[PDB]
Design a protein around this ligand. Sequence first.
Ligand SMILES: Oc1ccc2[nH]ccc2c1
Ligand SMILES: Oc1ccc2[nH]ccc2c1
Ligand SMILES: Oc1ccc2[nH]ccc2c1
Ligand SMILES: Oc1ccc2[nH]ccc2c1
Ligand SMILES: Oc1ccc2[nH]ccc2c1
Ligand SMILES: Oc1ccc2[nH]ccc2c1
Lengths: 268, 269
Amino acid sequence: GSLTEDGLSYKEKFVVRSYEVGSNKTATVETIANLLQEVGCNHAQSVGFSTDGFATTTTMRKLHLIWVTARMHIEIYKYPAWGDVVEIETWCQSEGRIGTRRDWILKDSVTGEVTGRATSKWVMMNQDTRRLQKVSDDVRDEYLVFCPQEPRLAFPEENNRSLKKIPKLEDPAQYSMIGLKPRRADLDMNQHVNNVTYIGWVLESIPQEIVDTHELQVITLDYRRECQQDDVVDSLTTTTSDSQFLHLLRLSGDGQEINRGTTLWRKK
Amino acid sequence: GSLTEDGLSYKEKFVVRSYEVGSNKTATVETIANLLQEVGCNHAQSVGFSTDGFATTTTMRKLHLIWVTARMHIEIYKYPAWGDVVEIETWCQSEGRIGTRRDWILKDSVTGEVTGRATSKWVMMNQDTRRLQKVSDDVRDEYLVFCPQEPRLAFPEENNRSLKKIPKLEDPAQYSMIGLKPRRADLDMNQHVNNVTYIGWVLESIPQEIVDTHELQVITLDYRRECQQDDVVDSLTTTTSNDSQFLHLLRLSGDGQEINRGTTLWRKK
Ligand SMILES: Oc1ccc2[nH]ccc2c1
Ligand SMILES: Oc1ccc2[nH]ccc2c1
Ligand SMILES: Oc1ccc2[nH]ccc2c1
Ligand SMILES: Oc1ccc2[nH]ccc2c1
Ligand SMILES: Oc1ccc2[nH]ccc2c1
Ligand SMILES: Oc1ccc2[nH]ccc2c1
């Protein structure tokens, strides 16, 4: 992969692997989400962020502050098949003092056609207290030089699917998958549950019949609280409708919300 | 990746990804095991095996026969770090009428030094009845042209760990992790549990303190029965032993039916 000519975005090509595909012989949405993190990580490294994995500025490390995902929104028009080459372009932009947004564009490297797009909201949090903080002047100055100054959006539409407020699923749920626990493979280099594991957990309560006759087109997921490697999660789903579903992940015991989301599926 | 000059082995390079590494900032043994399947799959495709994923000959498809793993043996000297390039070479050889063996050699693409090696035993099974069988003459003729004829072993040693018989763990186990279930990400393109998920399940009952102070050096795993996507597994571990050795057992949560048995050897960090 490499930074573009202006040094304000990063592109990388990936050949889809045999173990990265599902029943349709195309990449799962979890494989796509993993590739989005990989190209984001590779972009931060290319623009000077140290080999520790955190895209944190010098002042952020002094204050023990890290970036955390608040929301992920993915829309796939075509999933790449095993052996196909997908090209992904990523970039970041400041959203005032609220935080930052990382966007992605997926293309079929053979035709150049846009096959998907994704957007994410990131907030500054103290890594020890877990307290959310607004973005200070000094910190924004350190990362503005890595962002395009004119707006560049993967989802330009005024008040579109990526910015739609998500309601809380009311009991009883139509479908559920209980007792979901992460294993060591679900953790990252810092022993925290990988963000992509939560997408997998959300999708677990989708009936197999919907999976067998539909393809996932859109997924929006809000991140409320982390699952610790010793926690247990319940995944709840209710059809709201193409088929649309409302989702909720909560702790198995006390019912504490960890994520909420929505998915849109198209008939095969 | 590409076949070597003689067309009897296949090499492929991989750049280790950020999400493929563990706490030490090196590739997990599950990432390595996934790369071993990928290079094996790419080798079968390169030598003519159809895009359906099964390295099955024309006569095997007519008889509804597939290859299934009986045993996996992996030994890692050094795990590659995030951003490092690992080169993996793979090949297959017939083991008479018993079945086939696929071997792998892992190298640091920068120094060329051998950083790991792996071997696996494969048996022929009817896809529908699940009945195992010896390899017929006609089937062996179809795949011999893809194998080196002179023996080529990743584990040449006289008393190597890849061929050592594994005992059954006796209750009570010293350690355990119960209620392990696969999710859709654990399945393959045919809706079957990926072989690498079982390695993950075996390793779940290793205490976190061993993980935090040791590195996995060797793992041998026997595959007895398949876990269905609706099954639930218990992972059992008992220390058998500078180095730490463990005996492992995966069994169904309810009836206690054996899924896998194995052994791991760990060395102090
Ligand atoms: O989704 C991700 C995950 C990790 C990252 N590091 C830097 C950007 C980025 C994006
Ligand atoms: O912390 C940041 C913010 C904006 C960025 N653009 C590119 C990398 C990056 C890291
Ligand atoms: O909750 C929000 C809303 C907008 C945002 N922009 C960037 C981060 C963020 C978080
Ligand atoms: O380990 C593996 C898995 C799948 C495969 N297909 C062909 C060879 C091979 C090896
Ligand atoms: O079925 C087989 C046996 C040996 C092989 N060598 C390479 C691919 C392959 C497939
Ligand atoms: O149990 C065994 C023993 C030797 C073998 N060689 C190939 C498959 C196989 C299985």
